[PDB]
C-alpha cells in the first residue's frame, strides 16, 4: 500500500493474536504475506514462529524459535509481544533442570539485560508456569537461572 | 510588652482561682501592662518606647494615674 507501516502493524497484530495459549495456533499456516521482495522478506519471522509452534524437530525448532525471538527483540517487530514470547520460550528451556543452548544462552541473557534497562510489557496466558508468577521480572529471573544452570552443566563438555 | 519581667510583675499582683476548670481574675490591685496605672510609668524609658513617641505615652499614663487613681 503506502509503506511498511501497515505491514508491520499487521504482523504485530498477528503475533499478538497467535500468542494467547500454550500452542501458538489461531493463524497457523494461514499467513502467507507475499509482496515483491522487500515487503515479503520481513514476514519470515512470523512464518518461522508458526513453523516452530506447529511442528518440532529435536532442538532445531527451539533454536529457530530462539533466533526468531532474538531477531524480533532487536527493535524489528515492535516490542509489545516480544517480552511475552521471550517468557514463553524461557519456560520450555530448563526452568526445573539443566539443558544446553548453542549460540543462544548469551543472546537470551543480552536480550533480558536490554529489556530490563529499557521497557518490558508481558501479557500472555501461557500455562501453569505463568499463572503461578506475579511480577514481570520473575520470568527474567527464571530465564537467567536456567541460562546459568545450562552454562554450568554444559560448558564442561570438553573433547 | 515584649518582655517577660512585665508579665511576671503583673501576674504577682492578682489573685486567681480555679473555677469550673477556668481561671478568672477575682481580686486585682495593679497591672504592669502597657498604658495601665501607676505601675506602667517605670516601663516607659528611652530604651523601651523609642524616644519620638514616649513622652505622650508617659503624659497619658500620668494623667490617668492622677485622675482615675485612688
Amino acid at each position: 500500500a503506502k509503506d511498511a507501516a501497515f505491514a508491520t502493524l499487521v504482523s504485530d497484530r498477528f503475533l499478538r493474536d497467535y500468542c494467547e495459549r500454550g500452542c501458538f495456533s489461531d493463524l497457523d499456516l494461514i499467513d502467507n504475506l507475499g509482496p515483491a521482495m522487500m515487503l515479503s522478506d520481513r514476514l519470515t519471522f512470523l512464518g518461522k514462529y508458526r513453523e516452530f509452534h506447529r511442528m518440532y524437530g529435536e532442538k532445531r525448532f527451539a533454536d529457530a524459535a530462539s533466533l526468531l525471538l532474538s531477531l524480533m527483540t532487536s527493535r524489528i517487530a515492535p516490542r509489545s509481544f516480544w517480552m511475552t514470547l521471550l517468557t514463553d520460550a524461557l519456560p520450555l528451556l530448563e526452568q526445573k533442570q539443566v539443558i544446553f543452548s548453542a549460540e543462544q544462552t548469551y543472546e537470551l541473557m543480552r536480550c533480558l539485560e536490554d529489556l530490563t534497562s529499557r521497557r518490558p510489557v508481558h501479557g500472555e496466558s501461557d500455562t501453569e508456569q505463568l499463572q503461578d508468577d506475579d511480577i514481570e521480572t520473575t520470568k527474567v529471573e527464571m530465564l537467567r537461572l536456567s541460562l546459568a544452570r545450562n552454562l554450568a552443566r554444559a560448558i564442561i563438555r570438553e573433547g | 510588652k515584649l518582655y517577660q519581667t512585665p508579665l511576671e510583675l503583673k501576674l504577682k499582683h492578682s489573685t486567681v482561682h480555679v473555677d469550673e476548670l477556668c481561671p478568672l481574675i477575682v481580686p486585682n490591685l495593679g497591672v504592669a501592662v502597657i498604658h495601665d496605672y501607676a505601675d506602667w510609668v517605670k516601663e516607659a524609658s528611652g530604651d523601651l518606647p523609642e524616644a519620638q513617641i514616649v513622652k505622650h505615652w508617659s503624659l497619658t499614663w500620668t494623667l490617668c494615674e492622677a485622675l482615675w487613681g485612688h
Binding site: 534497562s117 529499557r118 521497557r119 503461578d132 506475579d134 511480577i135 514481570e136 521480572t137 529471573e141 | -
Partner: protein
Amino acid sequence: HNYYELLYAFHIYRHNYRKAGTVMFEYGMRLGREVRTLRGLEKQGNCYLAALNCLRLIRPEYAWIVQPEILELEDLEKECSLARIRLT
C-alpha cells in the same frame, strides 16, 4: 554460597511453617543494595519479583521484617520506578 544458604534456609522454613523467606530476602537486599547501574537494577528487579511472588502465594495475617509491608512495598516500587526512569 550465599544464594545456596538462602535457598537452604527457605527450604527448611517451608518444611515447617514457611515464615522467613521474605525476611531473608529483605535482609539480603539491604546488605547488598549499593552495587552499580546494571547489577543493582537486576538485583532490585529480582527482589521485587520475589516480593510479588511472596505476596501472591500467601494468605493469613501480616509478616514483613527488615522492611520499614504495604508502605515498604510502595516505597520499593517507587524506587524501582525512579531507577527505571533515570536509567532510560
